[PDB]
Amino acid sequence: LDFFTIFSKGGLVLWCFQGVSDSCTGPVNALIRSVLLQERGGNNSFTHEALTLKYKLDNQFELVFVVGFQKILTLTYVDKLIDDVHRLFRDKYRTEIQQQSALSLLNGTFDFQNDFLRLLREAEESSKIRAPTTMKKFEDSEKAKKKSLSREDMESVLDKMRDHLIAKNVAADIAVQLCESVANKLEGKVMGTFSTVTSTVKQALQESLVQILQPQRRVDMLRDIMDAQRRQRPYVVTFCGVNGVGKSTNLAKISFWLLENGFSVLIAACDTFRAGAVEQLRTHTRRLSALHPPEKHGGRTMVQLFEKGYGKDAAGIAMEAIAFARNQGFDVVLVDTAGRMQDNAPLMTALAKLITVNTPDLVLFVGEALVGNEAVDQLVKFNRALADHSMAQTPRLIDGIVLTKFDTIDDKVGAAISMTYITSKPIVFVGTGQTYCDLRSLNAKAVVAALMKA
Amino acid sequence: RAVLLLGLCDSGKTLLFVRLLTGHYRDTQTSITDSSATYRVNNNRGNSLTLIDLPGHESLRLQFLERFKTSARAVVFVVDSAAFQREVKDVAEFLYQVLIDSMSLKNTPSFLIACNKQDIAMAKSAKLIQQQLEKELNTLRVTRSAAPSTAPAQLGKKGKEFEFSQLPLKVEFLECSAKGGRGDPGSADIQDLEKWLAKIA
Amino acid sequence: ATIINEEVLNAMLKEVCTALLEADVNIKLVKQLRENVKSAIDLEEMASGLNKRKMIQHAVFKELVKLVDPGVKAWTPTKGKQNVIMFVGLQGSGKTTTCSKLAYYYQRKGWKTCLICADTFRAGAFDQLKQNATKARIPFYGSYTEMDPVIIASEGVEKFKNENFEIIIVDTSGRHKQEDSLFEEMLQVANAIQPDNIVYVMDASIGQACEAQAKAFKDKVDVASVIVTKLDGHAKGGGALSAVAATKSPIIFIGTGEHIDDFEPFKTQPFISKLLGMGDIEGLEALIEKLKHGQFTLRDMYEQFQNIMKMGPFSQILGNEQESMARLKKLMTIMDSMNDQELDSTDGAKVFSKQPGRIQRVARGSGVSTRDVQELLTQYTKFAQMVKKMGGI
Amino acid sequence: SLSLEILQIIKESQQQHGLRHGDFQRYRGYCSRRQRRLRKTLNFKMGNRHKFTGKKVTEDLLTDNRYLLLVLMDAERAWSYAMQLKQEANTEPRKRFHLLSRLRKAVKHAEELERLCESNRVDAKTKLEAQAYTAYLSGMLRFEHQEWKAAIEAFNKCKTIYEKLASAFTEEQAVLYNQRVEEISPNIRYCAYNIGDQSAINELMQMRLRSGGTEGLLAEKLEALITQTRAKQAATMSEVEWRGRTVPVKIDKVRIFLLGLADNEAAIAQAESEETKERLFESMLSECRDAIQAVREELKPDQKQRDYTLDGESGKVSNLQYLHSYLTYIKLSTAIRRNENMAKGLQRSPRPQDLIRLYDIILQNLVELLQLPGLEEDRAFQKEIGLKTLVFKAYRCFFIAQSYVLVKKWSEALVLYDRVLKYANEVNXXXXXXXXXXXXX
Amino acid sequence: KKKKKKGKLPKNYDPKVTPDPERWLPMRERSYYRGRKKGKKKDQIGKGTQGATAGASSELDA
Amino acid sequence: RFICIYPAYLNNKKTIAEGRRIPISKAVENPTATEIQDVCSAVGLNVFLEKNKMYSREWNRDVQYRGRVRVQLKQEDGSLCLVQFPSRKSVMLYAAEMIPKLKT
RNA sequence: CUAUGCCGAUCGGGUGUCCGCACUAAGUUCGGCAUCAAUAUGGUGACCUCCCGGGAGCGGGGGACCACCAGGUUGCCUAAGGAGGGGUGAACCGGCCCAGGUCGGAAACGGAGCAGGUCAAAACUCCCGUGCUGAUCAGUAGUGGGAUCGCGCCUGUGAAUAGCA
Ligand SMILES: Nc1nc2c(ncn2[C@@H]2O[C@H](COP(=O)(O)OP(=O)(O)NP(=O)(O)O)[C@@H](O)[C@H]2O)c(=O)[nH]1
Ligand SMILES: Nc1nc2c(ncn2[C@@H]2O[C@H](COP(=O)(O)OP(=O)(O)NP(=O)(O)O)[C@@H](O)[C@H]2O)c(=O)[nH]1
Ligand SMILES: Nc1nc2c(ncn2[C@@H]2O[C@H](COP(=O)(O)OP(=O)(O)OP(=O)(O)O)[C@@H](O)[C@H]2O)c(=O)[nH]1
Ligand SMILES: [Mg+2]
Ligand SMILES: [Mg+2]
Ligand SMILES: [Mg+2]
Amino acid at F31: P
Q: In angstroms, what is the span from residue A379 Cα to ligand 4's centroid?
A: 19
The residues after which chain A has a C–N gap greater than 2.5 Å are 146
- Comparing alpha-carbon positions, the chain C residue that sits nearest to E44 is C135
SS3 readout for chain C? CCHHHHHHHHHHHHHHHHHHHHCCCCHHHHHHHHHHHHHHHHHHCCCCCCCCCHHHHHHHHHHHHHHHCCCCCCCCCCCCCCEEEEEEECCCCCHHHHHHHHHHHHHHCCCCEEEEECCCCCCCCHHHHHHHHHHHCCCEECCCCCCCHHHHHHHHHHHHHHHCCCEEEEECCCCCCCCHHHHHHHHHHHHHHCCCEEEEEEECCECCCHHHHHHHHHHHCCCCCEEEECCCCCCCCCCHHHHHHHHCCCEEEECCCCCCCCCEECCHHHHHHHHHCCCCCCCCCHHHHHHHHCCCCHHHHHHHHHHHHHHCCHHHHHCCHHHHHHHHHHHHHHHHHCCHHHHCCCCHHHHHHHCHHHHHHHHHHCCCCCCHHHHHHHHHHHHHHHHHHHHHC
Sheet holding C113-117, edge to edge: C140-141, C113-117, C167-171, C83-89, C197-203, C226-229, C251-254, C264-265
Query: Can you list the alpha helix ranges (DSSP code H) found in D246-277?
Result: 252-269
Measured CA to CA, the distance from residue A314 to residue A374 in angstroms comes to 26
Tell me how many degrees the CA angle C104-C110-C114 measures, rounded to the nearest 5. Answer: 50
Q: In angstroms, what is the span from residue A20 Cα to ligand 5's centroid?
A: 24
Residue at the smallest CA–C1' distance to nucleotide G75: D101
Break chain E into its structural domains and give their ranges.
Answer: 7-35
Q: Whose CA is nearest to atom 21 of ligand 1?
A: A244
Break chain C into its structural domains and give their ranges.
Answer: 3-68, 83-276, 286-392
Q: Which domain holds residue A67?
A: 3-128
Backbone angles phi, psi at A235, to 5 degrees: -95, 120
* Chains in touch with D (≥3 Cβ pairs < 8 A): A
Check CB contact under 8 Å for A272 and E49.
yes
Measured CA to CA, the distance from residue C63 to residue C29 in angstroms comes to 11
Task: Give the single-character DSSP code of D234.
Answer: I
- Comparing alpha-carbon positions, the chain C residue that sits nearest to A246 is C92
Q: Which of ligand 2's atoms lies nearest the C-alpha of C230?
A: 32
How long is chain B?
201
CB neighbours of A121 closer than 8 A, spacing ≥ 6?
A: none
DSSP secondary structure letters along B27-95: -B----S-EEEEEE-SSSS--EEEEEE----TTTHHHHHHHSTTTEEEEEEEEESTTTTTTHHHHHHHH
Check CB contact under 8 Å for A311 and E49.
yes
Q: Residues of C annotated as binding site for GTP?
A: 89-96, 171-175, 229-232
**The domain spanning residue A35 has which CATH number?**
3.30.450.60
Ligand 3 contacts CB of residue B181 (under 6 A): no
CB neighbours of C222 closer than 8 A, spacing ≥ 6?
A: C190, C198
Check CB contact under 8 Å for E53 and C141.
no
Using the CA of F70, which nucleotide's C1' is the nearest one? G55
Ligand 2 contacts CB of residue C237 (under 6 A): no
What DSSP element (H or E) covers A316? helix A314-328
Instruction: Give Cα separations from C293 to A391, C17, C340 (angstroms).
Output: 81, 56, 21
Task: Inspect the structure and tell me whether chains C and A have 3 or more CB pairs less than 8 Å apart.
Answer: yes
All residues with CB under 5 Å from ion ligand 5: A 11; B 13-14, 31
Which contacts of F97-100 are long-range, i.e. CB under 8 A and separated by 24 or more positions? F97/F26, F98/F39, F99/F10, F99/F28, F99/F31, F99/F35, F99/F36, F99/F39, F100/F28
Is residue A271 part of an annotated ligand binding site?
A: yes
Q: Which residue, C223, C226, C222, is CA-closest to C253? A: C226
CB neighbours of D316 closer than 8 A, spacing ≥ 6?
A: D172, D246, D302
- Whether A365 contacts A398, CB under 8 Å: yes
CATH 3.40.50.300 fits C83-276, yes or no: yes
Query: Can you list the alpha helix ranges (DSSP code H) found in D271-314?
Result: 278-308
- Whether C255 contacts E39, CB under 8 Å: no
* Chains in touch with B (≥3 Cβ pairs < 8 A): A
Return the SS3 of A375. Answer: helix
Ligand 2 contacts CB of residue C270 (under 6 A): no
SS3 readout for A26-55? CHHHHHHHHHHCCCCCCCCCEECCCEEEEE
Ligand 1 contacts CB of residue A271 (under 6 A): yes
A232: left (phi over 0), alpha (psi -120 to 50) or beta: left
- Whether C193 contacts C170, CB under 8 Å: yes
Estimate to the nearest angstrom the gap between the alpha carbon of D274 and the chain centroid.
35
Ligand 2 contacts CB of residue C174 (under 6 A): yes
Disruptive mutation site among F61, F62, F63, F66 for chain C (greatest number of C CBs within 10 Å): F61
Check CB contact under 8 Å for A273 and E50.
yes
Strands C264-265 and F48-54: unpaired
Give the residues across from A70 on adjacent strands.
A51
Is residue B56 part of an annotated ligand binding site?
A: yes
Measured CA to CA, the distance from residue B158 to residue A339 in angstroms comes to 43
Q: Which residue, C210, C203, C175, is CA-closest to C189? A: C175
- Whether D362 contacts D393, CB under 8 Å: yes
Ligand number with the minimum distance to the CA of A36: 3
Ligand 2 contacts CB of residue C229 (under 6 A): yes
Interchain CB contact of B146 with A (< 8 Å)? yes
Q: Whose CA is nearest to atom 13 of ligand 2?
A: C94
- Comparing alpha-carbon positions, the chain C residue that sits nearest to F59 is C364
CATH superfamily of C286-392: Signal recognition particle, SRP54 subunit, M-domain (1.10.260.30)
What DSSP element (H or E) covers B174? strand B171-175
Q: In angstroms, what is the span from residue B102 Cα to ligand 1's centroid?
A: 41
Measured CA to CA, the distance from residue B144 to residue B160 in angstroms comes to 17
Backbone angles phi, psi at B39, to 5 degrees: -125, 130
Q: Which residue, B110, B6, B103, is CA-closest to B52? A: B6
Q: Which nucleotides of G are covered by protein (CB under 7 A)?
A: 12-21, 23-28, 32-33, 41-43, 46-50, 52, 54-58, 70-75, 77-83, 85-87, 91-92, 99-105, 110-116, 118-120, 130-134, 137-142, 147-155, 158-159
- Whether A375 contacts A401, CB under 8 Å: no
Disruptive mutation site among A6, A8, A9, A261 for chain B (greatest number of B CBs within 10 Å): A9
CB neighbours of F85 closer than 8 A, spacing ≥ 6?
A: F43, F73, F91, F94
Radius of gyration of chain D (CA): 32
What DSSP element (H or E) covers F53? strand F48-54
Radius of gyration of chain C (CA): 33
- Whether D321 contacts D296, CB under 8 Å: yes
- Whether A200 contacts A219, CB under 8 Å: no
Return the SS3 of D421. Answer: helix
Task: Inspect the structure and tell me whether chains D and F have 3 or more CB pairs less than 8 Å apart.
Answer: no
Show residues of chain E in contact with C147, CB under 8 Å: none
Show residues of chain A in contact with E51, CB under 8 Å: 275-276, 310
Is residue B116 part of an annotated ligand binding site?
A: yes
Q: How would you label B119-155 residue by residue, b for 16+ Cβ within 10 Å and e otherwise? A: beeebbebeebbebbeebbeebeebbebeebeeeeeb
CATH 3.40.50.10420 fits C3-68, yes or no: no
- Whether C84 contacts C170, CB under 8 Å: yes
Q: How far is the CA of F22 from the C1' of G42 (A)?
A: 32
Q: In angstroms, what is the span from residue A424 Cα to ligand 5's centroid?
A: 22
Ligand 2 contacts CB of residue C97 (under 6 A): yes
Backbone angles phi, psi at C115, to 5 degrees: -120, 140
What's the half-sphere exposure (Cβ side, CA atoms, 13 Å) at A346?
A: 0
Measured CA to CA, the distance from residue A64 to residue A57 in angstroms comes to 5
Give the residues across from B79 on adjacent strands.
B115
Within 10 Å of residue A89's Cβ, how many Cβ atoms? 22
Q: How would you label D145-173 residue by residue, b for 16+ Cβ within 10 Å and e otherwise? A: eeebeebbbbbbbbbbbbebbbebbeeee
Using the CA of D32, which nucleotide's C1' is the nearest one? G131
Q: Is A429 exposed, middle or buried (0-12, 13-18, 19+ CB in 10 A)?
A: buried
Check CB contact under 8 Å for D190 and A72.
yes
Q: Is B19 exposed, middle or buried (0-12, 13-18, 19+ CB in 10 A)?
A: buried
* Chains in touch with F (≥3 Cβ pairs < 8 A): C
What DSSP element (H or E) covers F66? strand F66-71
Q: Whose CA is nearest to atom 17 of ligand 1?
A: A246
Q: In angstroms, what is the span from residue F82 Cα to ligand 6's centroid?
A: 111
CB neighbours of A205 closer than 8 A, spacing ≥ 6?
A: A161, A178, A182, A452
Measured CA to CA, the distance from residue D409 to residue A304 in angstroms comes to 59
Q: Which residue, B87, B16, B99, is CA-closest to B58? A: B87
DSSP secondary structure letters along F69-90: EEE--B-SSSSBS-TT--SHHH
Q: In angstroms, what is the span from residue B172 Cα to ligand 3's centroid?
A: 22
Amino acid at A55: Y
Show residues of chain D in contact with A47, CB under 8 Å: 22
Smallest CA–CA separation between B7 and chain A, in Å? 13
Q: What structural domains and CATH numbers belong to chain D?
A: 6-47+56-236 (1.10.3450.40)
Tell me how many degrees the CA angle D406-D412-D417 measures, rounded to the nearest 5. Answer: 70
- Whether D117 contacts D126, CB under 8 Å: yes
Q: Whose CA is nearest to atom 3 of ligand 2?
A: C258
- Whether A262 contacts A256, CB under 8 Å: no
CB neighbours of A212 closer than 8 A, spacing ≥ 6?
A: A37, A39, A178, A417, A420, A421, B59
